[PDB]
């Protein structure tokens, strides 16, 4: 008995109380249906769900799984106007026009905008770009066989064209959530995903519906740059970094996650180090965002099976707490 009074919860309540102190089957269901509402009601903020409808051109919920990073892709329509300004004049600002068009060509306005870029789809698009390959290309094999190499190539041409003209992949693509449940139809998808709050507590189950599990698996042994090479136990933190090449490699796009205990005012410093990519010398690379806390250091897992054999790193427990973009330099 003593282990359940605490588990099934009365004692705290009693302290509170003292202070104050001093068709038959359908019928059964209605009675029970009511009980559930009352209990849910009697019981009772650690969860937030954002929901959105998009296409499956980019992104794609089904290929992805229970724990996944979805990034928003703001202003698709806008960008050309932005490219003309904020770009030094000798940048051939007509590059994007075609590139976004090119990305789009590979694959109008209609009534479902294509928002929601998946984390996956970036890892493949920049896979050959950032300096690692086939652990990175294994992710690229994942997307070509599930989510088209054209779109990956078109979208890669867009990333090159964006990093070219001073309109970055950030100032586009903000964090959206964790992908609870997609509900797709044809070319359409309605994606529910967590605005913020902990992941493991959502549809749950073995898997939330019948496929498998839940996790925020970095998807790359290529991503999941795990800082704290030298570290002490502490809540680990999760950021989102875009690294760039400005003619050193011809507008390189690097996208990955850093996991270490440093409060953003200390991440800018450690991002200054660990990069020899600073020899751009216009100015700017490496933006970062905190995906959220992992208020336990230990769940970072080493595994390689998903969808093809991919390096998949499993992150056990996460409290998405997104925040804004900061890159000034």
């Amino acid at each position: 008995t003593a282990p359940m009074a605490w588990a099934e919860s009365p004692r705290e309540l009693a302290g509170h109380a003292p202070l104050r102190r001093v068709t038959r089957a359908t019928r059964d269901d209605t009675e029970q249906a009511v009980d559930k509402i009352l209990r849910g009601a009697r019981r009772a903020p650690r969860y937030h769900l954002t929901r959105q409808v998009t296409l499956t051109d980019l992104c794609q919920p089904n290929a992805e799984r229970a724990g996944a990073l979805l990034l928003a892709l703001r202003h698709p329509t806008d960008l050309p106007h932005l490219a003309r300004h904020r770009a030094p004049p000798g940048r051939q600002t007509e590059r994007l026009a075609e590139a976004w068009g090119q990305l789009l060509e590979a694959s109008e306005s209609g009534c479902a905008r294509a928002g929601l870029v998946s984390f996956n789809f970036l890892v493949a698009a920049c896979t050959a770009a950032y300096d690692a390959r086939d652990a990175a290309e294994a992710v690229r094999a994942h997307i070509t066989t599930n989510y088209a190499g054209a779109r990956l190539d078109r979208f890669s041409e867009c990333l090159r064209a964006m990093v070219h003209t001073h309109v970055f992949p950030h100032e586009v693509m903000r964090f959206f959530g964790g992908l609870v449940s997609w509900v797709t139809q044809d070319e359409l998808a309605s994606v529910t995903a967590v605005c913020s709050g902990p992941q493991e507590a959502t549809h749950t189950g073995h898997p939330g519906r019948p496929c498998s599990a839940v996790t925020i698996p970095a998807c790359a042994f290529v991503d999941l740059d795990a800082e704290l090479c030298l570290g002490g136990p502490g809540a680990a933190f999760l950021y989102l970094v875009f690294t760039y090449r400005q003619c050193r490699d011809q507008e390189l796009c690097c996208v990955y996650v850093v996991k270490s205990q440093l409060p953003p005012r200390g991440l800018e410093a450690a991002l200054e180090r660990l990069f020899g990519r600073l020899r751009i010398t216009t100015c700017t690379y490496a933006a970062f965002a905190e995906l959220g806390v992992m208020p336990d250091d230990s769940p970072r897992c080493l595994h390689r099976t998903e969808r093809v054999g991919v390096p998949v790193v499993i992150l056990e427990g996460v409290v998405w707490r997104p925040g804004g973009w900061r890159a000034c330099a």
Partner: protein, 45 residues
């Protein structure tokens, strides 16, 4: 890309006892399917 996994339904009733006590992670290379959950996890249920 993974074995069908472990049966939690079977093993609810075991057919025998393991008589040793060791740390099985050291022998990790001996098994077809190895899962290690610290103090419980979601897939079990």
């Amino acid at each position: 890309r993974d074995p069908p996994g472990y049966r939690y339904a079977a093993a609810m009733v075991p057919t025998g006892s393991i008589l040793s006590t060791i740390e099985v992670a050291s022998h990790r290379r001996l098994f077809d399917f190895f899962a290690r959950v610290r103090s419980d996890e979601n897939s079990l249920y």
